Design a protein around this ligand. Structure first.
Ligand SMILES: *C(=O)CCCCCCCCCCCCCCC
Lengths: 156, 207, 193, 179, 186
């Protein structure tokens, strides 16, 4: 189904980490673990670099955005919003694209339990000194993690 | 009849506790409009500040927010009476009819769901019990910090108290013979569990 | 504009904070994708020069490994026919790391690679910590060209870079020759019946 | 409709950038070198981002084989027959960047065992898995053509720009057939 | 996919919960009235606090707007004007402000509110006849949203029907389209 799920923001800082394992739903879900801080910055570097390549050689008057990126083994499903908030997802092939799934996540989990969640912050880079990739203030909202795990439990 | 999106309305309605703290601090992030600088303070910081500022500061803020709710209820009551036209009289036939009107109409118009069952001691106080309480359905802190949750949502529970107090006003009893208090003592008895764990109870007493 | 005959790969490697980014501020076409250093690990600059009446394109790869680039930084020397080791004469650590950098280049880069030594921020004589004599002596043992560069002393790195490309071109250039009264009239068949 | 084909020699750096679009010419020669080098670097990054689940257990050496299309090529040099190859062949870059999907174009990458890289950009956006097979077959077609008319060339240094006359026109014909 | 307008009525018709306009008027009027009451009726910079409110709520509301519509990022103001004229207001307040007064070099423009649901039926006092705006929250939300789309623009009120002018206008002049951020490591 899937392997890992990542959320970045406008400020080039990874906001959410969820890594999966063998197809048991109650997998080794190390959420926001420091051990994957290394293999998130280079993923963001991949996505930013290929996005720049896509925009540079683009044509028309739409400024296209990358949809998916497949390596030999896995593939990357990416959804970038105008507000600067990237939803990336590692997964085996098995099916065409996850655009509907990522859109549903953005429109019914993040928007509902983070943006409309005035207790929690938004634009997690606060008062400079971590606006440019150097910081960690990852979300730990109870509802976000619970509902997100419930939603991705069938697909794995 | 004209309509407005419920999302923006709920966002505005939640945006009273940050108002209530910010205005009080103004009486007691630098940014430019066009030529003069104005200080803007993030909304989520003000809830933290209201939690951990002072007892008298908290009381002032809660009274202010209750006044806001009172104004909302007072203005809304006249339009509801004009439109739906309940079978109430001015001062008091029985309080049960008044509270039934509130439950059936005011919460239908403000929130998207009719308020749930209500107790009745038949002489004194009335308890209005609401399950899952729409305007805080997406309010959380942390997996472990659960006790902080209840204590730091408490200011948000004043606007419906103000609404009930205002609706009681302009309908006979004024705001001297009526005392109302909200609390989280409610349980999710047997309904399906929602995001927020705790219910809401409105203990309203009149004489 | 695909007129350049040869494409040489050069790597601009040095210690972090030495000032490589300012070092390659001159020999550039200051356009195109800026930054991208932290994304993949390299930023790209190009130069065009004619040597022996033959256009040459030189591509400069200013790699750096901060915390994430262990294997990729090694792979980025896959076919580099040139290297431009950089150190600052302010702190002896940058000069000390030159042997380690040269070890990586000669272990992984292209065989018989032409590699040089650049001394940046030489205008600041206040905090000098590495003498020219020691740097030159270290260059002698390892078959390298050596120079010192500064903002006030500019136009020296350009000449050193051109000279390095000339040294490369005298090594990876196969000799060639300029390959540049036909019958006219109606013919008659002569094939046998 | 493969609108652009470019190839990266062995270590980054561009050596052939013939494109077959009607008239765009938006990118100069200089930027395409940056594009190719960035592609090589992103390939290197993608190699070292396998999930932990697949690193220790692959069990997938049956899907690497590419089924062959009958006449994807056209309608020769050292080769002979109606096509360059009839049999099915195997994938080499099982741990590298393989395509890039975009709503306006799709990039395919085919890496030789030696290190030669062949990149094809197509305007067409197929179930997003058959198109991999089509692209791999076409790119091995182009690689065979390159091995014919670029490797058997006395006046061509290794891993340098491909300034030849037969190779480019024959790949132009080949891409013209495929549409 | 489709025109901005068609997207607007399509989303408004059957992809949104709704609430009565009069309740919205009552709530916002109560907010402004309490602000007037507790701030000693010093109308000079009650407007600043309403602007701060608008900024704060719009910073969250842009997330909902983009999650629903899922538009691309807006580059030039000719397209941004189309967007926030024919879909952004339509989703939330169910109105279609008109666009006129295109400044030179397409730098600025104005939103004309043919109907203002925030101020449906209000009568300001003589004290506030030329001091208060009463719809400052709207321009606050406009810029609070536009900041999150990576473009800075000063927005203010030129006129209002409540004060007695012919029409309500909102000039939305730009300052600079700030660039996206890139990581740095030294
Ligand atoms: C490019 O994507 C530009 C997007 C348009 C800006 C978003 C505007 C959303 C806010 C509109 C105002 C809603 C009413 C608020 C009053 C309470």
């Amino acid at each position: 189904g899937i392997y890992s799920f990542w959320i970045f923001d406008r400020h080039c800082n990874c906001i959410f980490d969820r890594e999966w394992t063998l197809a048991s739903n109650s997998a080794s879900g190390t959420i926001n673990s420091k051990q994957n801080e290394e293999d998130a910055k280079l993923l963001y570097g991949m996505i930013f670099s290929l996005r720049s390549i896509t925009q540079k050689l683009s044509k028309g008057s739409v400024k296209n955005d990358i949809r998916s990126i497949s390596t030999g083994k896995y593939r990357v499903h990416t959804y970038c919003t105008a507000s600067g908030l990237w939803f990336v997802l590692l997964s085996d092939f098995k099916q065409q694209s996850y655009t509907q799934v990522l859109q549903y996540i953005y429109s019914h989990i993040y928007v509902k339990y983070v943006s409309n969640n005035l207790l929690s912050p938004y634009d997690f880079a606060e008062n400079e000194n971590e606006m440019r990739g150097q910081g960690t203030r990852k979300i730990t909202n109870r509802n976000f993690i619970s509902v997100l795990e419930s939603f991705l439990a069938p697909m794995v | 009849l004209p309509k407005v999106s419920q999302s923006v309305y709920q966002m505005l309605l939640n945006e009273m506790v940050p108002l209530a703290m910010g205005i009080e601090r103004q009486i007691s992030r630098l940014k430019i409009e066009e030529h003069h600088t104005v200080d803007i303070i993030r909304s989520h910081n003000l809830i933290h500040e209201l939690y951990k500022a002072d007892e008298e500061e908290k009381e002032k803020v809660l009274a202010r927010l209750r006044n806001i709710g009172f104004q909302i209820g007072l203005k809304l009551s006249e339009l509801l009476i004009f439109s739906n036209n309940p079978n109430l009289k001015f001062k008091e036939m029985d309080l049960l009819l008044i509270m039934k009107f509130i439950c059936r109409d005011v919460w239908k118009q403000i929130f998207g769901k009719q308020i749930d069952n209500l107790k009745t001691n038949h002489r004194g106080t009335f308890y209005l019990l609401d399950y899952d309480y729409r305007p805080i359905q997406s309010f959380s802190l942390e997996e472990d910090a659960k006790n902080e949750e209840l204590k730091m949502i408490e200011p948000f529970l004043e606007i419906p108290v103000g609404i009930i107090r205002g609706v009681l006003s302009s309908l006979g009893y004024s705001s001297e013979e009526v005392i109302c208090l909200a609390s989280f003592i409610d349980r999710p008895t047997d309904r399906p569990k929602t995001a927020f764990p705790k219910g809401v109870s409105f203990h309203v007493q009149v004489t | 504009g695909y007129d350049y005959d040869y494409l040489f790969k050069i790597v601009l490697i040095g210690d972090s904070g030495v000032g490589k980014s300012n070092l390659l501020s001159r020999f550039t076409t200051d356009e195109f994708n800026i930054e991208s250093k932290s994304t993949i690990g390299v930023e790209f600059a190009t130069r065009t020069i004619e040597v022996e009446n033959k256009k040459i394109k030189a591509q400069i790869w200013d790699t750096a490994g901060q915390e994430r680039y262990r294997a990729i930084t090694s792979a980025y020397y896959r076919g580099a026919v040139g290297a431009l080791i950089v150190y600052d004469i302010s702190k002896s650590s940058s000069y000390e790391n030159c042997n380690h950098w040269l070890t990586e280049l000669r272990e992984n880069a292209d065989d018989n690679v032409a590699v040089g030594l650049i001394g940046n921020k030489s205008d600041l004589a206040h905090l000098r910590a590495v003498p020219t004599d020691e740097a030159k002596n270290f260059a002698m043992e390892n078959q390298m060209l050596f120079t010192e560069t500064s903002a006030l002393n500019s136009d020296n790195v350009d000449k050193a870079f051109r000279e390095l490309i000339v040294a490369i071109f005298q090594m990876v250039s196969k000799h060639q020759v300029d390959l540049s009264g036909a019958p006219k009239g109606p013919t008659i068949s002569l094939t046998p019946a | 409709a493969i609108e652009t084909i470019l190839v990266i020699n062995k270590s980054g750096g561009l050596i052939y950038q013939r494109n077959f679009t009607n008239d765009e010419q938006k990118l100069n020669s200089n930027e395409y070198l940056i594009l190719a080098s960035t592609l090589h670097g992103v390939f290197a990054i993608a190699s070292q981002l396998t999930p932990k689940a697949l690193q220790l257990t692959q069990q997938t050496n049956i899907e690497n084989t590419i089924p062959y299309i009958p006449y994807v090529g056209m309608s020769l040099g050292s080769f002979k027959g109606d096509d360059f190859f009839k049999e099915p062949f195997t994938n080499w870059n099982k741990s590298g960047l393989r395509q890039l999907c975009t709503d306006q174009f799709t990039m395919f990458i085919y890496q030789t065992l030696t290190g030669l890289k062949f990149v094809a950009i197509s305007s067409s956006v197929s179930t997003s898995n058959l198109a991999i097979q089509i692209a791999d077959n076409f790119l091995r077609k182009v690689y065979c053509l390159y091995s014919d008319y670029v490797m058997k060339d006395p006046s061509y240094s290794m891993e340098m720009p491909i300034r030849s006359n037969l190779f480019d026109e024959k790949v132009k014909k080949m891409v013209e057939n495929l549409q | 996919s489709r025109s901005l307008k068609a997207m607007g009525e399509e989303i408004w018709k059957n992809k949104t919960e709704k609430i009565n306009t009069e309740l919205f008027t009552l709530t916002y009027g109560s907010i402004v009235a309490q602000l007037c009451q507790d701030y000693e009726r010093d109308f000079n910079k009650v407007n600043d606090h309403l602007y701060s409110m608008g900024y704060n709520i719009g910073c969250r509301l842009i997330e909902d707007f983009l999650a629903r519509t899922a538009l691309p990022r807006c580059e030039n103001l000719v397209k941004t004007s189309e967007v926030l004229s024919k879909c952004a207001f339509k989703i939330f307040l169910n109105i279609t402000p008109n666009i006129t007064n295109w400044s030179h070099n397409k730098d600025t423009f104005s939103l004309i509110l043919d109907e203002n649901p925030l101020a449906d039926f209000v009568e300001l006092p003589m004290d506030a006849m030329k001091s208060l705006w009463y719809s400052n929250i709207l321009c606050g939300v406009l810029k609070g949203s536009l900041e999150m789309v990576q473009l800075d623009c000063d927005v203010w009120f030129v006129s209002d029907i409540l004060r007695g002018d012919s029409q309500t206008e909102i000039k939305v002049k730009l300052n600079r389209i700030l660039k996206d951020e890139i990581p740095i490591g030294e």
